Design an enzyme around this catalytic site. Structure first.
Site, PDB file in Angstrom:
ATOM      1  N   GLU A  65      -1.380  -1.835 -36.518  1.00 41.20           N
ATOM      2  CA  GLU A  65      -0.910  -0.690 -37.102  1.00 41.20           C
ATOM      3  C   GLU A  65      -1.947   0.549 -36.972  1.00 41.20           C
ATOM      4  OE1 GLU A  65       0.528  -0.727 -41.472  1.00 41.20           O
ATOM      5  OE2 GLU A  65      -1.727  -0.035 -41.213  1.00 41.20           O
ATOM      6  N   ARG A  80       2.516  -4.585 -39.739  1.00 43.36           N
ATOM      7  CA  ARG A  80       3.424  -3.967 -40.567  1.00 43.36           C
ATOM      8  C   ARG A  80       4.374  -2.998 -39.784  1.00 43.36           C
ATOM      9  NH1 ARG A  80      -0.520  -1.409 -44.480  1.00 43.36           N
ATOM     10  NH2 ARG A  80      -0.591  -2.935 -46.215  1.00 43.36           N
ATOM     11  N   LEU A 125     -14.818  -6.219 -50.348  1.00 43.80           N
ATOM     12  CA  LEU A 125     -15.522  -6.579 -49.218  1.00 43.80           C
ATOM     13  C   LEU A 125     -15.194  -5.968 -47.707  1.00 43.80           C
ATOM     14  CD1 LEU A 125     -14.151 -10.403 -50.077  1.00 43.80           C
ATOM     15  CD2 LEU A 125     -16.447  -9.543 -50.391  1.00 43.80           C
TER      16      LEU A 125
HETATM   17  O1  LIG Z   1      -9.095 -15.336 -45.690  1.00 42.65           O
HETATM   18  C1  LIG Z   1      -9.809 -14.094 -45.977  1.00 42.65           C
HETATM   19  C2  LIG Z   1      -8.922 -12.870 -45.432  1.00 42.65           C
HETATM   20  C3  LIG Z   1      -9.321 -11.536 -45.597  1.00 42.65           C
HETATM   21  N1  LIG Z   1     -10.816 -11.353 -45.862  1.00 42.65           N
HETATM   22  C4  LIG Z   1     -11.320 -10.102 -45.882  1.00 42.65           C
HETATM   23  O2  LIG Z   1     -10.514  -9.199 -46.732  1.00 42.65           O
HETATM   24  C5  LIG Z   1     -10.775  -7.911 -46.264  1.00 42.65           C
HETATM   25  C6  LIG Z   1      -9.397  -7.061 -45.944  1.00 42.65           C
HETATM   26  O3  LIG Z   1      -8.866  -7.898 -45.036  1.00 42.65           O
HETATM   27  P1  LIG Z   1      -7.934  -7.325 -43.803  1.00 42.65           P
HETATM   28  O4  LIG Z   1      -8.577  -6.017 -43.332  1.00 42.65           O
HETATM   29  O5  LIG Z   1      -7.731  -8.274 -42.868  1.00 42.65           O
HETATM   30  O6  LIG Z   1      -6.691  -6.742 -44.657  1.00 42.65           O
HETATM   31  P2  LIG Z   1      -5.181  -6.122 -43.994  1.00 42.65           P
HETATM   32  O7  LIG Z   1      -5.135  -4.846 -45.239  1.00 42.65           O
HETATM   33  O8  LIG Z   1      -5.541  -5.847 -42.796  1.00 42.65           O
HETATM   34  O9  LIG Z   1      -4.062  -6.806 -44.807  1.00 42.65           O
HETATM   35  C7  LIG Z   1     -11.620  -7.997 -44.790  1.00 42.65           C
HETATM   36  O10 LIG Z   1     -12.968  -7.693 -45.304  1.00 42.65           O
HETATM   37  C8  LIG Z   1     -11.634  -9.322 -44.501  1.00 42.65           C
HETATM   38  O11 LIG Z   1     -12.909  -9.955 -44.267  1.00 42.65           O
HETATM   39  C9  LIG Z   1     -11.480 -12.471 -46.109  1.00 42.65           C
HETATM   40  O12 LIG Z   1     -12.544 -12.344 -46.266  1.00 42.65           O
HETATM   41  N2  LIG Z   1     -11.040 -13.515 -46.267  1.00 42.65           N
HETATM   42  N1  LIG Z   2       2.960   4.038 -43.777  1.00 45.43           N
HETATM   43  C1  LIG Z   2       1.669   3.751 -44.126  1.00 45.43           C
HETATM   44  N2  LIG Z   2       1.220   2.473 -43.338  1.00 45.43           N
HETATM   45  C2  LIG Z   2       0.023   2.157 -43.458  1.00 45.43           C
HETATM   46  N3  LIG Z   2      -0.833   2.581 -44.624  1.00 45.43           N
HETATM   47  C3  LIG Z   2      -0.426   3.710 -45.409  1.00 45.43           C
HETATM   48  C4  LIG Z   2       0.964   4.334 -45.016  1.00 45.43           C
HETATM   49  N4  LIG Z   2       1.073   5.253 -46.126  1.00 45.43           N
HETATM   50  C5  LIG Z   2      -0.056   5.342 -46.749  1.00 45.43           C
HETATM   51  N5  LIG Z   2      -1.042   4.332 -46.326  1.00 45.43           N
HETATM   52  C6  LIG Z   2      -2.409   4.118 -46.787  1.00 45.43           C
HETATM   53  C7  LIG Z   2      -2.544   3.881 -48.064  1.00 45.43           C
HETATM   54  C8  LIG Z   2      -4.266   4.391 -48.588  1.00 45.43           C
HETATM   55  O1  LIG Z   2      -5.080   3.484 -48.093  1.00 45.43           O
HETATM   56  C9  LIG Z   2      -4.077   5.556 -47.542  1.00 45.43           C
HETATM   57  C10 LIG Z   2      -3.614   6.835 -48.154  1.00 45.43           C
HETATM   58  O2  LIG Z   2      -3.362   6.846 -49.366  1.00 45.43           O
HETATM   59  O3  LIG Z   2      -3.068   5.189 -46.242  1.00 45.43           O
END
Ligand SMILES: O=c1ccn([C@@H]2O[C@H](COP(=O)(O)OP(=O)(O)O)[C@@H](O)[C@H]2O)c(=O)[nH]1
Ligand SMILES: Nc1ncnc2c1ncn2[C@@H]1C[C@@H](O)[C@H](CO)O1
Ligand SMILES: O=c1ccn([C@@H]2O[C@H](COP(=O)(O)OP(=O)(O)O)[C@@H](O)[C@H]2O)c(=O)[nH]1
Ligand SMILES: Nc1ncnc2c1ncn2[C@@H]1C[C@@H](O)[C@H](CO)O1
Lengths: 223, 219
Positions: free
Chosen positions: A34, A94, A154
């Site tokens: 994304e 996404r 984290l």
């Molecule tokens: O099993 C897991 C899955 C995710 N993360 C952590 O959670 C945070 C956010 O995860 P990620 O960026 O992958 O989430 P997304 O928003 O992309 O779904 C990161 O620090 C990852 O290291 C983790 O520690 N253990």
């Molecule tokens: N459309 C979007 N896709 C992915 N992330 C989004 C989108 N709209 C807002 N967000 C995120 C939510 C937050 O982390 C930041 C602005 O609030 O961007």
């Protein structure tokens, strides 16, 4: 013939983690990350500028952000139809549905977009897409808003340490209406019946991910 | 088969007048008129754009240019059909969004993002929205302001003169001197017709329409 799968989930549930996991496991498996998560710590310029803005004054910028961020996604998954892939699978990070039914729709409800911005956005969206990236499946990575909350912790990105439990809870509820209860109605007939797989990721899986993935290969075998 | 010609020009130079005039003289001649002229939400956004243009310019331009794009795509489907647009996607960009940026009602990020988008909105969908020729309705800004009062409009009765001047020089540069450069390279070639509409022509358009035909005859 490339099947398209969208991986969905709340802020910080483990999407780019997981997405980078199956990446390594198959030569027939590619992903499109994304664009918003990469701006997020020259398209990088524009992308970098609009995100800090969006945070600072969502009531001004949600409409410019949501259009830019969605345009960004369409052109990225497009440039991937090319790129690579005998038994191809494209994983999206996404989808253009996420953009609209989770984030944009949420900012209207929060009033950061007014009737006019939302109505325009909705037909730009409706239109921009009628004119290929339909998905074959949806994988829902399920985590509670508190798991996402600590995982934003984290991650330690500056901007997101702000983000409060209440905004996560808000987005969680919309993922559950859309992907579990299938309560939500869409203006895209097919996305009422796209098969969906829901994976529970409250438990860390970064090195204990075999069942999750067996679950993925199964569901993929049934499409 | 179906040639597309743009009628260009400052506000109230007479474009809506000339295309309606042209529209009755030939079964081959149809037109697609710019939606902002027409202006539900387009009407709220248009009204907001007069109120706080530093707030709504990015949003208006978007909607205005895609509202145009579909309108022209909707029309695009006689022996020698000719479809005149009431301005083009280029006007939107190198006359209006330009100016508004130049006047600081769009910031850099807004501007860059719009150009990007535009760049892509009108390429993905360039299938014959591309112009065969251009007809520059040329008017002095002092003329256009009487026609502003002529047309009698709410919001419009206060266009400073100075703005109209902002819009003139941009037209002249693009359309007369041809100083202006783009990213629609074909454009910096396409035949341009420059018409003087300072003289009222509501009931005296034969010389105007003669030239349009001498012009169409060479495309
Ligand atoms: O099993 C897991 C899955 C995710 N993360 C952590 O959670 C945070 C956010 O995860 P990620 O960026 O992958 O989430 P997304 O928003 O992309 O779904 C990161 O620090 C990852 O290291 C983790 O520690 N253990
Ligand atoms: N459309 C979007 N896709 C992915 N992330 C989004 C989108 N709209 C807002 N967000 C995120 C939510 C937050 O982390 C930041 C602005 O609030 O961007
Ligand atoms: O020869 C002309 C051409 C135009 N007008 C009037 O000027 C006003 C604005 O012209 P129009 O809407 O055509 O200008 P546009 O903005 O469409 O260029 C209208 O009320 C016209 O009736 C006129 O009196 N004499
Ligand atoms: N893109 C545009 N096309 C036609 N008219 C426009 C556009 N942008 C601004 N306008 C005009 C200028 C002013 O008369 C009114 C409000 O901005 O609309």
């Amino acid at each position: 013939r490339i099947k398209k799968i969208s991986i969905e989930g709340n802020i910080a549930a483990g999407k780019s983690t997981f997405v980078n996991i199956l990446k390594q496991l198959s030569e027939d498996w590619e992903v499109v990350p994304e664009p918003v998560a990469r701006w997020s710590n020259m398209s990088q310029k524009n992308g970098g500028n609009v995100l800090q803005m969006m945070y600072e004054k969502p009531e001004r910028w949600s409409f410019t952000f949501q259009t830019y961020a969605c345009l960004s996604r369409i052109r990225a998954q497009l440039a991937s139809l090319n790129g690579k892939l005998e038994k191809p699978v494209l994983f999206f990070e996404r989808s253009v549905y996420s953009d609209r039914y989770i984030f944009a729709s949420n900012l209207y409800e929060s009033e950061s977009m007014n009737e006019t911005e939302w109505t325009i956005y909705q037909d730009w969206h409706d239109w921009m897409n009628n004119q290929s990236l339909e998905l074959d499946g949806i994988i829902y990575l399920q985590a509670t808003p508190e798991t996402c909350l600590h995982r934003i912790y984290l991650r330690g990105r500056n901007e997101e340490q702000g983000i409060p439990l209440e905004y996560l809870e808000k987005l969680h509820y919309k993922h559950e209406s859309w992907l579990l209860h299938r309560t939500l109605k869409t203006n895209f007939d097919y996305l009422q019946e796209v098969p969906i797989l829901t994976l529970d990721v409250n438990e860390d899986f970064k090195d204990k991910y075999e069942s999750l993935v067996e679950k993925v290969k199964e569901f993929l075998s049934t499409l």
